[PDB]
Ligand binder design. Structure first.
Ligand SMILES: N[C@@H](Cn1c2c(c(=O)[nH]c1=O)CSC2)C(=O)O
Ligand SMILES: [Cl-]
Ligand SMILES: [Cl-]
Ligand SMILES: [Cl-]
Ligand SMILES: [K+]
Ligand SMILES: [K+]
Length: 254
């Protein structure tokens, strides 16, 4: 009956500050793929919402004591009804929150500057000159932290070693990719987006694994099943494919 609290994060092209001469406020400040997805779910399901940015600007991971941060924490403490963001569905975070069915599929990969003909994530693990990392307290960071693959255990020992190999967000990871010999372990769909706009950047190698982005809710959320059915209906008619095309289309690279 009331307006849901939506926690989210600035992540292009998923959630961004709309451009305007006016000073914007409320939901009107935001636009992007996830905002379109939210508009569509709110229309189908008949709910309203208030979008709030998570104060610590993080997706969510556990520390050594087991406490969460990020949007995951927001759902745990019930300070948000939904998390609408490129939020990875992981069985680790299922210990604390719940997820709708995925609205987008992706995989971890490598964002690197075209110049060295490396082709594999293994090529990074067996050296030290090219520093590499991922977004701190994210699902890509946690995937290497908890992996049992001998190659990925090798890479996590690196990132655990260097202080600033773990970056605050994708923007600063991409910037570091352009200004240093650095490789960013980043998710497939973002790499597609960045490398279409930054012709100096390329995807290195295929996908490391497979995951899906879902809308997160508190455990036992009454809106969660309604969201899942709505998302599944949208994928049947390929409306989420159209929606990705709308926000990913652009210049292209020679
Ligand atoms: N999906 C991750 C966050 N996250 C994201 C991107 C990425 O490249 N790495 C990463 O960890 C680009 S969309 C968000 C999470 O939910 O923790
Ligand atoms: Cl509003
Ligand atoms: Cl806000
Ligand atoms: Cl679809
Ligand atoms: K403005
Ligand atoms: K309402």
């Amino acid at each position: 009956n009331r307006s849901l609290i939506v926690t989210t994060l600035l992540e292009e092209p998923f959630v961004m500050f709309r451009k305007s001469d006016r000073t914007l406020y409320g939901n009107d400040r935001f636009e992007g793929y996830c905002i379109d997805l939210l508009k569509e779910l709110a229309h189908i399901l008949g709910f309203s919402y208030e979008i709030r940015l998570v104060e610590d600007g993080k997706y969510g991971a556990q520390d050594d004591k087991g406490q969460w941060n990020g949007m995951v924490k927001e759902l745990i403490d019930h300070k948000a009804d939904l998390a609408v963001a490129p939020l990875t569905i992981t069985h680790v975070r299922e210990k604390a929150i719940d997820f709708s069915k995925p609205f987008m599929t992706l995989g971890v990969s490598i964002l690197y500057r075209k110049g060295t003909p490396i082709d594999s994530a293994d090529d990074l693990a067996k050296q030290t000159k090219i520093e590499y990392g991922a977004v701190k307290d994210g699902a890509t960071m946690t995937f290497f932290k908890k992996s049992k693959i001998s190659t990925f255990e090798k890479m996590w020992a690196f990132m655990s070693s260097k202080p600033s190999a773990l970056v605050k967000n994708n923007e600063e990871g991409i910037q570091r990719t352009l200004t240093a010999d650095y490789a960013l372990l980043m998710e497939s769909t973002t790499i597609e987006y960045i490398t279409q706009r930054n012709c100096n950047l390329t995807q290195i190698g295929g996908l490391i694994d497979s995951k899906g982005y879902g809308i997160g809710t508190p455990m036992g959320s009454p809106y969660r099943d309604k969201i899942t059915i709505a998302i599944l209906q949208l994928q049947e008619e390929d409306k989420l494919h159209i929606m990705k095309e709308k926000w990913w289309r652009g210049s292209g690279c020679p």
